[PDB]
Design an enzyme around this catalytic site. Sequence first.
Site, PDB file in Angstrom:
ATOM      1  N   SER C  82     -29.931  25.823 -33.306  1.00  0.00           N
ATOM      2  CA  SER C  82     -29.605  26.988 -32.469  1.00  0.00           C
ATOM      3  C   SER C  82     -30.846  27.774 -32.018  1.00  0.00           C
ATOM      4  O   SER C  82     -31.644  28.217 -32.857  1.00  0.00           O
ATOM      5  CB  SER C  82     -28.748  27.953 -33.275  1.00  0.00           C
ATOM      6  OG  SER C  82     -28.759  29.245 -32.728  1.00  0.00           O
ATOM      7  N   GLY C  83     -30.954  28.029 -30.717  1.00  0.00           N
ATOM      8  CA  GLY C  83     -32.044  28.888 -30.208  1.00  0.00           C
ATOM      9  C   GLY C  83     -31.855  30.350 -30.615  1.00  0.00           C
ATOM     10  O   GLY C  83     -32.802  31.054 -30.943  1.00  0.00           O
ATOM     11  N   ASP C 145     -31.236  23.086 -29.032  1.00  0.00           N
ATOM     12  CA  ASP C 145     -31.177  24.067 -27.955  1.00  0.00           C
ATOM     13  C   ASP C 145     -32.518  24.204 -27.208  1.00  0.00           C
ATOM     14  O   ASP C 145     -33.532  24.599 -27.778  1.00  0.00           O
ATOM     15  CB  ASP C 145     -30.839  25.374 -28.622  1.00  0.00           C
ATOM     16  CG  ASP C 145     -30.446  26.466 -27.674  1.00  0.00           C
ATOM     17  OD1 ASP C 145     -30.720  26.379 -26.432  1.00  0.00           O
ATOM     18  OD2 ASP C 145     -29.837  27.449 -28.232  1.00  0.00           O
ATOM     19  N   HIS C 172     -29.925  20.462 -25.161  1.00  0.00           N
ATOM     20  CA  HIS C 172     -29.149  21.123 -24.133  1.00  0.00           C
ATOM     21  C   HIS C 172     -29.905  22.145 -23.273  1.00  0.00           C
ATOM     22  O   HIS C 172     -30.769  22.842 -23.766  1.00  0.00           O
ATOM     23  CB  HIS C 172     -27.881  21.707 -24.699  1.00  0.00           C
ATOM     24  CG  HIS C 172     -28.044  22.848 -25.648  1.00  0.00           C
ATOM     25  ND1 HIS C 172     -28.215  24.144 -25.229  1.00  0.00           N
ATOM     26  CD2 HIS C 172     -27.827  22.918 -26.986  1.00  0.00           C
ATOM     27  CE1 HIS C 172     -28.171  24.957 -26.271  1.00  0.00           C
ATOM     28  NE2 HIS C 172     -27.933  24.234 -27.352  1.00  0.00           N
ATOM     29  N   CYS C 183     -27.872  34.938 -24.704  1.00  0.00           N
ATOM     30  CA  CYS C 183     -26.754  34.327 -25.404  1.00  0.00           C
ATOM     31  C   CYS C 183     -25.569  34.288 -24.433  1.00  0.00           C
ATOM     32  O   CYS C 183     -25.370  35.217 -23.681  1.00  0.00           O
ATOM     33  CB  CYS C 183     -26.390  35.200 -26.624  1.00  0.00           C
ATOM     34  SG  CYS C 183     -24.943  34.760 -27.507  1.00  0.00           S
ATOM     35  N   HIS C 185     -22.631  34.857 -24.891  1.00  0.00           N
ATOM     36  CA  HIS C 185     -21.651  35.893 -25.222  1.00  0.00           C
ATOM     37  C   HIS C 185     -22.221  37.293 -25.132  1.00  0.00           C
ATOM     38  O   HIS C 185     -21.582  38.264 -25.571  1.00  0.00           O
ATOM     39  CB  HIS C 185     -21.037  35.561 -26.578  1.00  0.00           C
ATOM     40  CG  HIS C 185     -20.396  34.214 -26.585  1.00  0.00           C
ATOM     41  ND1 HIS C 185     -20.891  33.162 -27.315  1.00  0.00           N
ATOM     42  CD2 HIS C 185     -19.348  33.725 -25.874  1.00  0.00           C
ATOM     43  CE1 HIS C 185     -20.158  32.086 -27.073  1.00  0.00           C
ATOM     44  NE2 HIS C 185     -19.212  32.403 -26.207  1.00  0.00           N
ATOM     45  N   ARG C 220     -25.226  22.689 -19.875  1.00  0.00           N
ATOM     46  CA  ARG C 220     -24.402  23.850 -20.129  1.00  0.00           C
ATOM     47  C   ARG C 220     -24.307  24.696 -18.894  1.00  0.00           C
ATOM     48  O   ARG C 220     -25.330  24.916 -18.230  1.00  0.00           O
ATOM     49  CB  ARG C 220     -25.017  24.667 -21.264  1.00  0.00           C
ATOM     50  CG  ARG C 220     -24.603  26.109 -21.371  1.00  0.00           C
ATOM     51  CD  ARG C 220     -25.149  26.725 -22.635  1.00  0.00           C
ATOM     52  NE  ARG C 220     -25.198  28.165 -22.487  1.00  0.00           N
ATOM     53  CZ  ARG C 220     -25.444  29.035 -23.459  1.00  0.00           C
ATOM     54  NH1 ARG C 220     -25.663  28.638 -24.710  1.00  0.00           N
ATOM     55  NH2 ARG C 220     -25.471  30.334 -23.172  1.00  0.00           N
ATOM     56  N   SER C 309     -17.820  29.518 -31.386  1.00  0.00           N
ATOM     57  CA  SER C 309     -18.791  30.578 -31.509  1.00  0.00           C
ATOM     58  C   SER C 309     -18.457  31.681 -32.502  1.00  0.00           C
ATOM     59  O   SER C 309     -17.410  32.314 -32.411  1.00  0.00           O
ATOM     60  CB  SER C 309     -19.032  31.224 -30.130  1.00  0.00           C
ATOM     61  OG  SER C 309     -19.976  32.283 -30.247  1.00  0.00           O
ATOM     62  N   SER C 311     -19.580  34.423 -32.131  1.00  0.00           N
ATOM     63  CA  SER C 311     -19.513  35.623 -31.315  1.00  0.00           C
ATOM     64  C   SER C 311     -18.038  35.943 -30.984  1.00  0.00           C
ATOM     65  O   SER C 311     -17.752  36.993 -30.442  1.00  0.00           O
ATOM     66  CB  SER C 311     -20.350  35.461 -30.034  1.00  0.00           C
ATOM     67  OG  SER C 311     -21.748  35.318 -30.299  1.00  0.00           O
TER      68      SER C 311
HETATM   69 NA    NA Z   1     -28.783  29.210 -27.306  1.00  0.00          NA
END
Ligand code: NA
Lengths: 424, 422, 423, 423
Positions: C82-83, C145, C172, C183, C185, C220, C309, C311
């Site tokens: 995850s970034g 990411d 991605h 992000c 979200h 994405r 997610s 989030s």
């Molecule tokens: Na990300």
Amino acid sequence: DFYSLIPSAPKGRFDGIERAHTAEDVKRLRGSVEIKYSLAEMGANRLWKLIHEEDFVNALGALSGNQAMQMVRAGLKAIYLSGWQVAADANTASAMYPDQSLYPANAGPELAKRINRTLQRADQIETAEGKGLSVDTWFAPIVADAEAGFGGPLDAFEIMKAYIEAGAAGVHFEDQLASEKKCGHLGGKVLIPTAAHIRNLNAARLAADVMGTPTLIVARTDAEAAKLLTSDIDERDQPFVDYEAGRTAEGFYQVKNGIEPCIARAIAYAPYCDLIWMETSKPDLAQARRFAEAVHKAHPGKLLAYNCSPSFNWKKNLDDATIAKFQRELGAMGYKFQFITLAGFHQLNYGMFELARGYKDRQMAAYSELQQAEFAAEADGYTATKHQREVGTGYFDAVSLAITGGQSSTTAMKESTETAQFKP
Amino acid sequence: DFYSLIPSAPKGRFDGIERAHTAEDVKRLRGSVEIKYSLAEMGANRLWKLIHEEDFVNALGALSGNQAMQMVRAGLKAIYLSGWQVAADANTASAMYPDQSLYPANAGPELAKRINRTLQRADQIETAEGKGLSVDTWFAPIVADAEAGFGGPLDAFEIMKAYIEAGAAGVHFEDQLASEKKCGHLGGKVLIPTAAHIRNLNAARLAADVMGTPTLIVARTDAEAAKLLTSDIDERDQPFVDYEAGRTAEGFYQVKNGIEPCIARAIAYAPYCDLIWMETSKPDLAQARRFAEAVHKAHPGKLLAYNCSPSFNWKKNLDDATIAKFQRELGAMGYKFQFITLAGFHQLNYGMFELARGYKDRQMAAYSELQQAEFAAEADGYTATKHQREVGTGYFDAVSLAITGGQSSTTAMKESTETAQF
Amino acid sequence: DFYSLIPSAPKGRFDGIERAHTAEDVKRLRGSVEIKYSLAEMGANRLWKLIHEEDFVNALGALSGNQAMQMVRAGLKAIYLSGWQVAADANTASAMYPDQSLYPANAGPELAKRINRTLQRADQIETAEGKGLSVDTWFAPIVADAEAGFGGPLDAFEIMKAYIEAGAAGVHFEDQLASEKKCGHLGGKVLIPTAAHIRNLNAARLAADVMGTPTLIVARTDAEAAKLLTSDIDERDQPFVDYEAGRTAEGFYQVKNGIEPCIARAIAYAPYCDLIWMETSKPDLAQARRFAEAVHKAHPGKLLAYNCSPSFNWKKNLDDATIAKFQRELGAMGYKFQFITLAGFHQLNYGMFELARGYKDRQMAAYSELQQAEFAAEADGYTATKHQREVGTGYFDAVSLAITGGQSSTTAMKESTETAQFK
Amino acid sequence: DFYSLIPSAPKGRFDGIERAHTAEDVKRLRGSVEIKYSLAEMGANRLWKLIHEEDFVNALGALSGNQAMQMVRAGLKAIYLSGWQVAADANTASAMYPDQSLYPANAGPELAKRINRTLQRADQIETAEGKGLSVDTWFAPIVADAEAGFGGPLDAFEIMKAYIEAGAAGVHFEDQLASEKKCGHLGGKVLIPTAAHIRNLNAARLAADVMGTPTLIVARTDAEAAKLLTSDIDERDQPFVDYEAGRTAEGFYQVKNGIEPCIARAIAYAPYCDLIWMETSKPDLAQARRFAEAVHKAHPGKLLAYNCSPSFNWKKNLDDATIAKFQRELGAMGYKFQFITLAGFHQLNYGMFELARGYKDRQMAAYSELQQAEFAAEADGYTATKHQREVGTGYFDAVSLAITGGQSSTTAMKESTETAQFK
Ligand code: NA
Ligand code: NA
Ligand code: NA
Ligand code: NA
Ligand code: NA
Ligand code: NA
Ligand code: NA
Ligand code: NA
Ligand code: NA
């Protein structure tokens, strides 16, 4: 008001400087404790002194600590930190890149830190020898390249803070689109709107304010050659937009380039920086004068910077006499910071190529020639032939003797070949 | 048995080499998947060919990728990676240090990685230009400095793997106490026992075996000038111990230094290394021959290395005739790898001091003189005056044109001042 | 044709994949020597196999090697890098950042390299103990990411290469403006033109081709919630541009967000990626089905990916029954890669907050509770209570013994408290 | 004298402290310009205060900034920085190692830097929110592991400086041979002479002197379990040497280990450090008491440190009542700094192993369990369920608004799912 937030700032330091943010913003965004950035403080105040006291301050781009050290030893008073050189041979991706902001955003501040730490050792060595420094100070201010800010205003904010933590004295930001950033003397350049660059600059100043340092900000315009612009949203830019030409397939607007948009942008940027720099296609004193006169009609006394670029073929452009007077003339026009961006890269590459060719041809004869030239340069203040001392062997000897109350059996210098073979 | 574990290794690569471990140890300690280290393979094998086929392979210590690049551009066939220079100006502590293993153990391999990536870009650039290479290969082998192993045999094992991962061709280890490590030409050196340095060498070979690469190992002895030793536990060291002197306050033994303990240590190390190096106080061809003859009596044909050190004042020691023949004469004795350790440091610091002084005094005249010398050197193969091309601007323009089916508006070279003024 | 340039690519690997560049471009831009990227090759091929053979491949975001290791030990078959988590707690500026591409571009690949080296030690330890592996492979593929590619197409190209050298299996890239990346979200997202994101995907593919690895590319789109766009220059984006609203002061165009522009962009991106991913505002199976159905209409059998997610407030959105079946349903629609982005961050922060609060309150009793919980988990395959073995102490003992022909006086495990107190 | 060289040092700070070097040495070795190390000063001064005013200061090993942040939020007053944890999952070789000084010497201080920068961000966020802080301070002192100094006295000197630059408050050094360093609870430990460790300690103090900071130095002895010694040169060590056993093949002397040599070494080290620490094989209050008493006989009031080690099997050693009082009893004996070295490692690894196992089994039900536990912990001061705020998104929004005089279009929080779904 801002002076009480930046206590080291000298009287008059922010005369004529505008900020989009308030002094209350600064306090709200500082966090709750006082962290000091000693080298950034000292460097910024000394730079500020130097540009107001000297005919002009001239520098060379250093790609290493040792390079910087020799610049200060030779008597230069500032160090330039080139993003181009960082790209070529000194970045945090460990790769060789062209000058297109391809390396990671931390790379420039990492080199600044290296430069200050080497200057620090130099200082420690001479201090420990007890005979005074051989220079006015080892901490020559570093004016450092932040390129296009590496994205948006928050990116500019972040690299400004990183440079201050590293001890940079001044940082420069240019009105290019960061994702298409070029060397000033490459084609393919894309400008961002006058307002967008003013945002970058204000971000830089907010970073300085919040860190509590009077760090210098240099605003650079790339409009002399750039023919593309991301958006025509800013009415100050629209007069230079060629609407008939339409947009490119990327959506970029096309613009009329030259001194005119440089002057307009520089006059708009002036209140948000401490120095103004315009990239040029040629080392042209007449153009330099026209730019300085136009800026100074709007902002009398504004300090300027000028890139004496190795991307110019000097003798193709200029005769020997004009070359000789170039920087002095620029200084009298108000260009108080002048720098050869790629000086370190050219010196390193040329010098090692010639050494290596000679070595290939004649082996140790080629190396002995370098060492003899080193000995001959000692009359002029060169010290590095005695390389053990240069890098601090004697200082650490003295560290060990202090730790052991004089008793260490394993000190370095005494039975060294340097000591035995390198006497007057 | 070891050839199967190191598929790239050439015929006779391990003739006369002994190992403390077995082939089964290697399979056991190597994990369950094959991971390739292509530059380490290519480099080791090319260094092996070179040191056998050439009269000698001479090198210069490189402190940056650009330096290595010009070395290879100029025709040199190997690169030396100096720990001294890592310490001075290119380490992972971002500090200037004297040569005492003060920097973090990863710093040498990080510079080896930098050097290989610069050479990689050079090869990419020329490949893309499509007129063939300007050199035999950009991937000149790197012989790298692991100092005293940075502690115990496991530290030696770890720096060897790191160097393999970075793409080094050969790595050198010396018989000093890592916690008191010195430049060979400094005082205050402390030796470790013969057996202990054989553990370091065997740690290094086990690392290469477990990585599956035929990486060269260079054993260095510091016994010519060192007068201290950690322990007299090894009977091979005991004849050189000055038992009348008593131990130092730290517990070190005092030893009789010189060519004799160097010969003894070399002969002891020979089965556990590929090349052998003795540090000397002076550049002494008679001493070098005496060393080579003693080693060759016990181990005929053993390959040797020699440090043509800048820590020597060459003209004070030698006349011009001898300086001129020095490396050729060494090569004829079997010193197949010869290197000037601090070449990069002296070039960089001399060159910048002089440019800076010229610039202070004469501003742009001093820089234009450099540029002019650059243009003059182009007749002999120099390219860097055209700096945009040199670092890969044309290459990345080509990448962009491919990505965008030829359509990009923002390529760099066409409207550059480089194209217009050079 | 491209299969010769990528020798490890399985049969059919590039079915349906279009490239802006030619095979000759790849040979021209590759340099002159063959360099192998073994973990990238293995990871790509194993990932490719898994997503075609499993009902679905699910993963959790790892912010460290140890995290990754326990994921694999627990029986998960993939790892998500995850970034967001890099920004938070594991980047090369050594700072805590929100998820806005503020960290240096090298950080994710650096974390990729950390994960793969931890996995490598896991595998060395178990290889040296001689009884086989406790998992199918320690080298679970990493899907990593690359955010918005950190700038223009060349930055996308560079971060792809870096992830390849680090051993990532898949990477991605998203259709946001790198300089304003958020992000998915968060608010304030700005899209790039459909064409510009195709340029990024193509850069990524050129990167894999030149490296010679069959690395997976996940496209994405952030168009479900993004209301800003840099330019209307691509005709494909113009039906979603609100021309009544005018441009913001930055010059951004305003757009009509939602499923429709996500579907349009996905269908446009499909020939240039191996998996498609649409960010969503809520964990909604019906919208997931609508998206999948629309994409599959234009591109039958296209593999998709879904962000489960943190989030989202899960129990606020969904009942327990729906939460329980959620990933299984997504699988049948074609969502063959599914991942909890911030899994590592939430377990790390929750875990340490509760331990620290227990410690403040009750000191060693709170720690002993954790230790006994560790002992109890051993019945389900947990091993880390014996931390000395876990990190390789026995492996390094065995290296020292190999070096010293069995004679070293200084090996660690035999006289350790672990050997005496953990029998 | 030394007080003028270290301006921030409080009255009495160096009571009883001896130095091998002079005030003039410090001036000679210091360079010519004053550089400030603000976090190092504040840290040291606060730690000094805390260990004199609290019954005891208890800490947990943090392997990441986020972990440290939650420790401070939960109300702990100091942070421990474990070299063991650096080795395992947080070092500059990007590798998993056992605890044997295998990683590069800069890794510990780099982690110190991460920790202080995360704490700085937490502080920036709360300061920007304008409601005051939720903790006494975010800048809890860090006590950091310098292991065996990574070589000689000069290596100790350098790692000390590096830690001071990173903002550590206190640093610990042990009397082990750096080239054979082990975890105190592993076998194969080799001691150095009492004199040699005193040189390390003086090196550390000269480093702090030269930096101008009152940094705490903790001396650790590994003599309770160590049976090997590099040299018998120091007459203080010779009564423990088993001369009849002879030397090992490496040349090491063989020693009688136990409380006795720990007492003699501690008493010799005392003038050269601020706290003394003895590694033990078991959590034994009687042994703790015996050491404290013997040290306090020679040096009354000497502050001590104690490792509450996860290398002990707690319930196997002790009953619940002794576990519960353990730290309080140590505190009354003069152990004013107590730390659980591997708390971050065991939490990170147990937590992820269990989350991943549940996720394998039950997919989103298992994550929703975590998220619900997080919501439930909010009553006891947990905040990271709202992860966007936790890492500084609100703060960076405030930065953007200041830069743009209220005008930015692209702020993140307002239209976020955190704002909509975590009310
Ligand atoms: Na990300
Ligand atoms: Na630049
Ligand atoms: Na970029
Ligand atoms: Na060396
Ligand atoms: Na050292
Ligand atoms: Na950014
Ligand atoms: Na430790
Ligand atoms: Na070590
Ligand atoms: Na005895």
